[PDB]
Design a binder for these strands. Structure first.
Lengths: 85, 49, 115, 166, 205, 113, 186, 161
RNA sequence: AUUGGAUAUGCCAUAUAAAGCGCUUUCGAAGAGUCGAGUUGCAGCUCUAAAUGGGUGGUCAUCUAA
RNA sequence: UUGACCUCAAAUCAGGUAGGACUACGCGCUGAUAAGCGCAGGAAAAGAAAAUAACCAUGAUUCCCUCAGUAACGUGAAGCGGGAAAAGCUCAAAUUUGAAAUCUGGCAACAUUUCUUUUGUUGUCCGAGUUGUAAUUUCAA
């Protein structure tokens, strides 16, 4: 049949971060600091025990997808703290 | 017990954050009062105030 | 532990009564609102047509009935069903456009303050 | 407002700030009674999100529960609801824990207060069907416990259906 | 460092979402059968399997296994190598249970077994690539951790009309072949060109 | 489909060295093209696999003789077994009821005279 | 001792004996006596109108309208200090506030713990003053949490540029390392 | 038989006799008054609706209706509608008359302005004329309410008529 | 005699207001010791997330929990 | 000396509120479904998709017939289809900031009643509330 292109539901835009929410998380990421395993990872991501670092996140978080997201999360911290300090 | 890692809030952001435009109800008499005045004004015609 | 059907003549009449007591209040307007024509979703039944839940947000916009004036005049809305193909849309405009052609809404008195 | 920042902060529960307030408040919560009334909700955002408006008639309690088999959060809804026989339960959330106790709070609503009764967003709970909701498994965590959801995950056959004509 | 106490055969027993207890007991049987493997936590990316190489790169493994629980109805199996290699997905069914009273084999945990390969596998180069892969997979390498030097199991591979019939037998002094318990009907499905990726090599038909 | 040349190239890419010892390979393929055509008879394929295994076990032990490895393990050795202990205890108890019927089978058949 | 007092001195000391994170450490170092007497002197012109005497001017506004007169055409945009936590977070994110005042005794400390970090980022000069109730007295309240000047009239702009310079030079210019190290453990 | 109901029968106090059950009295019409006239109370619902001109359902009926006597392409559908579907048996035509004359006196929706609303527009119109409404959203003083460029024209129609 | 929703009509109302839908050179916030993995009898214990993300189903389809 | 504020108390303070009984039917708790424990109504639970589907798609929940003794593993569904009934929505998250626009309570007038027994309006004075009460919005947007 003669199929239409439908617009997108306004609910499928859940999961997209705004510019105001990303500014909320960035502030609270530092003002809350780092958890008593995420201090451990930041050391191992600083002196490049990379295979050892990824081993701990998988064991603690449970899944590589999270265990890769932290890497991407925490490595942005050190590369921004070398310009602050 | 390390120091304070202010890696993000070190600098200053120059822009505002929310981008939705300034509404028109901040540049005119407070329309909530204008409704409130008419409740008092009506009350004078009924003679309760 | 059984399920005996001695009330089956009675639920028929109780439904029949409560379908007449529904019509007492709504004496000039139907006892049930118009339902769309939607095709069943399996490979087995996709050639059939049957009544569904309600008219979509763009079946209804295209017929001239807004989503707010819809449920006043007795037109169910389905905020979940969407019109994938024209045929799903052209069949159901001719459900509304006949319904609006055959329906007469009684007017009402307004509340404009005077003086 | 402040509730955006206070939601994302409340998620980083193990970080240094969220851990320091955990040790401090677990100390004060433990010397208090097993069930003792709050005056403000400790998490004024989670309480605000779960239903608590800050008007008269909304009562915040908080209760520790022993760890280690009904779900702990469910019993915090019941034990507070047996300590207050008038108040109607809305929700109950997590605020703190330690190696030996989980701390919760509970949102309770007075059905007799003529401020709840005059308010059409919370007037559903004055009705008598909502008597001891936490008993019947009719609330936020009593619904999750008993598998009441929508999904393939979560006597009707055991009786023979003998119709008239068969 | 990057490699220390290096064993040649390192496998990963990665399950899928929705395996039954009987479907899971066989996986734990192969865990006991293959001491050169390292069972990890389940990967909830039940369809994004192309990123499993980094998981193998995390544990520095050499063999892989993703026993995909099909539709929570059947049980499948796929295996590949760390560097691309052959990723040949197969279908597994009609398995002999390893916790039943019927199986009465006598084998030792970690014993280096003797694997028997049929000439039918050696006949087709598509099967010959699988045969050598099967020779590298089920066999423990030289110097495995918690392994035994003696042989207490006998692996027999017979392609039963296009489906490999697993046969784990335990020998006794006289060869006195008695089934150890591991025996499943393994019919191959297809073969990927790389490590769970690349173009399809063949449909089995 | 069925790119056997690429499969042979894959067989070359996965070409395990032939210089590896049979004990190091820990495998003994049957030299005969063992084809048990009895798809209906499961007992025929079970013995054929056992016969091919016995042919392999004879060849592997001969290869292990060159490797000078202990093909037989010590009975006094109490290392970890593949079979579980509690299941093996239930396995021995499972065979008790079978022979009890066989004992009653041989006795009653002899009692038929 | 009563049943509760022996807690009331101990939660005083456990805030001292423990390790205060640098986010919370700055909430006890506080604006001094002197410079916290001029801030509230500037604010005591810009109090919100008391709710009793806002109505008093509303009955005087609604009586002339009932005859035909008006003042809405000549009503100039009002002024006062801006208060409330949720209204002042949006006054900082929009870069509208010019002096944010944080109480030093908010009971759940997470309510204001992001504000000295938000004021450092958005460039709004800030200071932490004592006694949430002291702010509450400014705006006719029991307990205020924060205030903010966003716009004083042309009368006090020259005063405000001076009093902020006392706020940075005493709170922000100082207190610069005690906010960057852990506290407590005394 | 029951402890509750052994009590009343062995007593001498009459039962609370409430006769409240007779069938065949089908509920009389309220809500509307015209249909109250042409309703006949014995005839069932679907025989009244489809006698005096109306439907009980616009959809399909899931049963065999009574028979008493031996009875003897997208451009043109989104634009064209069916006709008025004219009225038979004169009572659904009576309903036409009640639905038009009521909407004939309750049809005028002109709004006279207030004393202020007249003068607010009056002050605006004497400063720039009667056509350039679009720049009155940029007037500083007399547009003290900051009204729209459209809303002023809405009052300007209400100004004259 | 109490009571129902209506019909017409009288008086009040305060409307400086509120609402439907075009039109957008603009914006569009979405629920955590929860999800999730490991593991003992949907609960217990250990650990603990993310924003086109997350869930359930065949790269796609469909949904928007706490 | 004094004054706020927080917390905690006391009162035969002002006004309210909770137990207990029936338990056919409802919903939970553990449990050899039975018994025991707990909790409501005229119904209750359920409920407007973190649902199916693989189609030319269906569209909250409930219930009946069927799917069907079928798939799946002696136990035993569910989608589709056919019926009955159909009604949708409300918050949190965006600053009312040109004005806490919100509400309980005390007193006094005016009514009003299933009712001298009921239920409200208006005026006024505290009090609650800026650690957020109203207007606005709930993704269908």
């Amino acid at each position: 049949l003669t199929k239409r292109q439908l617009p997108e539901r306004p609910s499928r835009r859940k999961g997209h971060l705004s510019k105001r929410t990303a500014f909320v998380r960035s502030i609270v990421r530092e003002v809350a600091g780092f958890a008593p395993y995420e201090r451990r990872v930041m050391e191992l991501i600083r002196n490049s025990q990379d295979k050892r670092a990824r081993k701990l996140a998988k064991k603690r978080l449970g899944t590589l997808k999270r265990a890769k997201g932290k890497i991407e999360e925490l490595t942005s911290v050190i590369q921004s703290s070398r310009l602050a300090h | 017990y390390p120091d304070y890692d202010d890696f993000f809030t070190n600098t200053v952001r120059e822009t505002p954050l929310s981008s939705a435009p300034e509404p028109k109800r901040r540049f005119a008499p407070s329309k909530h009062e204008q409704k409130r005045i008419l409740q008092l004004a009506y009350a004078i015609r009924k003679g309760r105030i | 532990y059984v399920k005996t059907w001695f009330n089956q003549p009675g639920r028929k009449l109780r439904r029949r009564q409560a379908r007449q007591t529904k019509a007492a209040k709504i004496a000039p307007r139907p006892v049930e609102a118009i339902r769309p024509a939607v095709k069943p979703p399996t490979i087995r039944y996709n050639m059939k047509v049957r009544a569904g839940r309600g008219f979509t947000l763009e079946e209804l916009k295209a017929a001239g009935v807004s989503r707010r004036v819809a449920s006043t005049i007795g037109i169910p809305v389905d905020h979940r069903r969407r019109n994938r193909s024209e045929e799903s849309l052209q069949r159901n405009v001719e459900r509304i456009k006949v319904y609006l052609a055959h329906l007469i809404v009684f007017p009402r008195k307004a509340g404009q303050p005077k003086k | 407002g402040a509730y955006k920042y206070l939601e994302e902060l409340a998620k980083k529960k193990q970080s240094d700030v969220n851990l320091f307030l955990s040790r401090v408040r677990a100390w004060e919560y433990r010397q208090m009674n097993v069930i003792h009334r709050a005056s403000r909700p400790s998490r004024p955002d989670k309480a605000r999100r779960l239903g608590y408006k800050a008007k008269q008639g909304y009562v915040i309690y908080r209760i520790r529960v022993r760890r280690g088999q009904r779900s702990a959060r469910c019993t915090a809804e019941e034990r507070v609801g047996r300590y207050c026989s008038n108040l109607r339960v809305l929700n109950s959330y997590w605020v703190n824990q330690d190696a030996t106790y989980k701390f919760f709070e509970v949102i309770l609503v007075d059905p007799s207060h003529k401020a709840i009764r005059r308010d059409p967003r919370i007037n559903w709970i004055v009705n008598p069907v909502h008597k001891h909701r936490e008993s019947r498994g009719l609330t936020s965590i009593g619904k999750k416990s008993r598998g009441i959801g929508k999904g393939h995950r979560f006597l009707r056959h055991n009786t023979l259906s003998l119709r008239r004509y068969r | 460092s990057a490699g220390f106490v290096p064993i040649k055969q390192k496998v990963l027993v990665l399950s899928s979402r929705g395996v039954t207890y009987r479907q899971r007991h066989l996986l734990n049987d192969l865990v006991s059968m293959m001491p050169h493997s390292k069972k990890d936590s389940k990967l909830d990316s039940k369809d994004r399997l192309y990123q499993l190489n980094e998981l193998a790169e995390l544990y520095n493994c050499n063999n892989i296994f993703f026993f995909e629980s099909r539709r929570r109805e059947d049980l499948y199996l796929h295996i590949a190598r760390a560097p691309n290699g052959p990723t040949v997905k197969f279908h597994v069914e009609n398995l002999h249970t390893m916790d039943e009273l019927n199986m009465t084999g006598n084998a030792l945990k970690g014993s280096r077994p003797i694997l028997s390969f049929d000439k039918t596998f050696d006949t087709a180069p598509h099967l010959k690539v699988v045969k050598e892969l099967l020779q590298q997979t089920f066999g423990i390498p030289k110097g495995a951790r918690r392994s035994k030097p003696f042989i207490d199991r006998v692996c027999t591979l017979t392609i039963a009309d296009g489906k490999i019939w697993f046969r784990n037998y335990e020998i006794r002094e006289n060869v006195t072949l008695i089934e150890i318990g591991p025996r499943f009907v393994m019919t191959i499905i297809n073969i990927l060109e790389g490590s769970f990726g690349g173009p399809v090599i063949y449909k089995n038909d | 489909i069925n790119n056997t040349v690429a499969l042979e190239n894959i067989y070359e890419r996965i070409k395990y060295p032939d210089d590896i010892s049979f004990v190091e390979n820990q495998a003994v393929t049957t030299k005969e093209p063992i084809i048990i055509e009895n798809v209906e008879d499961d007992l025929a394929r079970e013995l054929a696999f056992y016969k091919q295994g016995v042919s392999s076990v004879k060849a592997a032990f001969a290869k292990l003789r060159e490797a000078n490895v202990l093909i037989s393990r010590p009975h006094d050795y109490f290392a970890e077994m593949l079979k579980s202990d509690d299941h093996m205890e239930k396995v021995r108890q499972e065979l008790i009821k079978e022979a009890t019927a066989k004992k009653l089978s041989q006795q009653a058949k002899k009692q038929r005279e | 001792w009563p049943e509760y007092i022996r807690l009331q001195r101990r939660r005083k000391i456990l805030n001292l004996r423990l390790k205060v994170p640098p986010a919370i450490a700055q909430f006890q170092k506080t604006l001094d006596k002197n410079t916290a007497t001029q801030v509230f002197k500037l604010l005591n012109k810009y109090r919100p109108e008391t709710a009793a005497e806002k109505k008093q001017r509303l009955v005087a506004e609604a009586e002339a309208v009932a005859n035909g007169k008006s003042a809405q055409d000549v009503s100039k945009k009002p002024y006062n200090v801006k208060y409330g936590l949720n209204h002042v977070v949006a006054l900082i994110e929009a870069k509208k506030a010019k002096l944010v005042l944080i109480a030093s005794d908010v009971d759940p400390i997470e309510l204001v713990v992001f504000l000295p970090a938000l004021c450092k980022k958005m460039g709004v000069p800030y200071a932490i003053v004592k006694n949430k109730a002291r702010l509450g007295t400014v705006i006719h309240q029991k307990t205020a949490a924060v205030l903010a000047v966003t716009e004083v009239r042309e009368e006090d702009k020259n005063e405000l540029a001076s009093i902020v310079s006392a706020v940075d030079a005493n709170f922000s210019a100082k207190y610069d390392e005690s906010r960057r190290k852990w506290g407590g453990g005394i | 038989a029951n402890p509750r109901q052994r009590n009343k029968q062995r007593s001498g106090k009459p039962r609370l006799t409430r006769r409240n059950a007779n069938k065949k009295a089908k509920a009389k019409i309220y809500g509307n008054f015209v249909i109250q006239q042409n309703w006949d109370k014995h005839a069932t619902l679907r025989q009244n609706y489809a006698r005096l001109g109306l439907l009980a359902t616009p959809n399909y009926v899931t049963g065999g209706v009574e028979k008493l006597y031996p009875d003897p392409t997208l451009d043109d559908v989104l634009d064209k509608e069916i006709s008025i579907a004219p009225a038979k048996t004169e009572v659904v035509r009576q309903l036409e008359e009640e639905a038009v004359k009521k909407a004939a006196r309750q049809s005028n929706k002109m709004l006279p302005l207030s004393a202020f609303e007249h003068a607010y527009i009056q002050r605006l119109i004497n400063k720039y004329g009667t056509e350039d409404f679009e720049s009155m959203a940029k007037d500083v003083k007399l547009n003290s309410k900051l009204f729209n460029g459209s809303k002023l024209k809405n009052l300007y129609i209400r100004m004259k008529a």
